[PDB]
Design a protein around this ligand. Structure first.
Ligand SMILES: Cc1ccc(OC[C@H]2CCCN2C)cc1C(=O)N[C@H](C)c1cc(-c2cnn(C)c2)nc2ccccc12
Ligand SMILES: [Cl-]
Ligand SMILES: [Cl-]
Ligand SMILES: [Cl-]
Ligand SMILES: [Cl-]
Ligand SMILES: [Cl-]
Ligand SMILES: [Zn+2]
Ligand SMILES: [Zn+2]
Ligand SMILES: [Zn+2]
Ligand SMILES: [Zn+2]
Ligand SMILES: [Zn+2]
Ligand SMILES: [Zn+2]
Length: 312
């Protein structure tokens, strides 16, 4: 017989003694070692002393699972371990002082999101996400990338959209203090003010330019006549401006980072543009730099703290 450790969070470890005759699935249930399904695998000698991930089978494991992951989905652990099995074999090179991902299994949208998260201020609510976030910034982003896929209900190889991945991650972050006050202007109905909170206060779909959002954009009113919507007040550490892929010029120092999308719908490829001392383009493990940039951009990220418009 061998002595092992079972856990759901890799923190609260539980001591267990197993029988080498019965497989792990008969004694613990669905069991995993470093992302590998060891349910139908009998206990081995190298397995002694190692820590095993198990699906919660009692209330103590269930409670511990929620405190770390903030989910009660019984499929989360398996989807997490299934993604981890791939992400542990990916390469995570340091590029321009940032942790990127060598291209594999259509992970270009994951690398772009990973590079973006290292350049904006964000705090994740699930301790599992925050801990992996920290380790990702230090260069060990395998667990973080697997968690992103599990939280987004995406599998390795699936075609991913960066704007949708960021929105899913934003919903698992503390954006309660983020406030956005808007104002619509219609020739017939008049002027109406709205206040957005949370994820809706930091994301917009329609234009890439934060300045254009401040000046105003044409949105259709409920009466038929076109209206004008502009930003009144913004209280957030950042702002994400999105638009369908189109040719766009990125000026050095006017933005934080941006998402470049080339190719067909869903089947395209992502690249990451970041504004440093000069404009840098990160394509997985490849790095290029230029003083100017013009290309198909679909997301742009800007810095912010507090903004109040001057329009009367
Ligand atoms: C890469 C990718 C993976 C999946 C995916 O779809 C999953 C969606 C489907 C609906 C629900 N969710 C599962 C889309 C893409 C993709 O290609 N994203 C680029 C940036 C893109 C966006 C838009 C567009 C226009 N409006 N909105 C709101 C987004 N249009 C594009 C037109 C041409 C080329 C790229 C476009
Ligand atoms: Cl929650
Ligand atoms: Cl959740
Ligand atoms: Cl790719
Ligand atoms: Cl979700
Ligand atoms: Cl959460
Ligand atoms: Zn939560
Ligand atoms: Zn793989
Ligand atoms: Zn969720
Ligand atoms: Zn009206
Ligand atoms: Zn109107
Ligand atoms: Zn790709």
């Amino acid at each position: 017989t061998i002595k092992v450790f079972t856990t759901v969070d890799n923190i609260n470890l539980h001591t267990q003694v197993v029988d080498m005759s019965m497989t792990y699935g008969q004694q613990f249930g669905p069991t995993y070692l470093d992302g590998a399904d060891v349910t139908k695998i009998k206990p081995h000698n190298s397995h002694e002393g190692k820590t095993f991930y198990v699906l919660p089978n009692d209330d103590t494991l269930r409670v511990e699972a929620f405190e770390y992951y903030h989910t009660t989905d019984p499929s989360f652990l398996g989807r997490y371990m299934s993604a981890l099995n791939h992400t542990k074999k990916w390469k995570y090179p340091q590029v321009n002082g940032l942790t990127s991902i060598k291209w594999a299994d259509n992970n270009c949208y994951l690398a772009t999101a990973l590079l973006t998260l290292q350049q904006i201020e964000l705090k994740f609510n699930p301790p599992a996400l925050q801990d992996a976030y920290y380790r990702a910034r230090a260069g060990e982003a395998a667990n973080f990338c697997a968690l992103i896929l599990a939280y987004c209900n995406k599998t390795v190889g699936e075609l991913g959209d960066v704007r949708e991945t960021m929105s899913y991650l934003f919903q698992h972050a503390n954006l309660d203090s983020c406030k956005r006050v808007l104002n619509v202007v219609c020739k017939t109905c008049g002027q109406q003010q709205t206040t957005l909170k949370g994820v809706e206060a930091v994301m917009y779909m329609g234009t890439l330019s934060y300045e254009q959002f401040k000046k105003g954009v044409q949105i259709p009113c409920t009466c038929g006549k076109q209206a004008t919507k502009y930003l009144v007040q913004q209280e957030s550490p950042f702002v994400m401006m999105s638009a369908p892929p189109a040719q766009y010029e990125l000026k050095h120092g006017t933005f934080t980072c941006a998402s470049e999308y080339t190719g067909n719908y869903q089947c395209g490829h992502y690249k990451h543009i970041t504004s440093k001392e000069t404009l840098y383009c990160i394509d997985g493990a490849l790095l290029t730099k230029s003083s100017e940039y013009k290309g198909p951009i679909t997301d742009v990220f800007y810095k912010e703290n507090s903004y109040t418009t001057t329009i009367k």
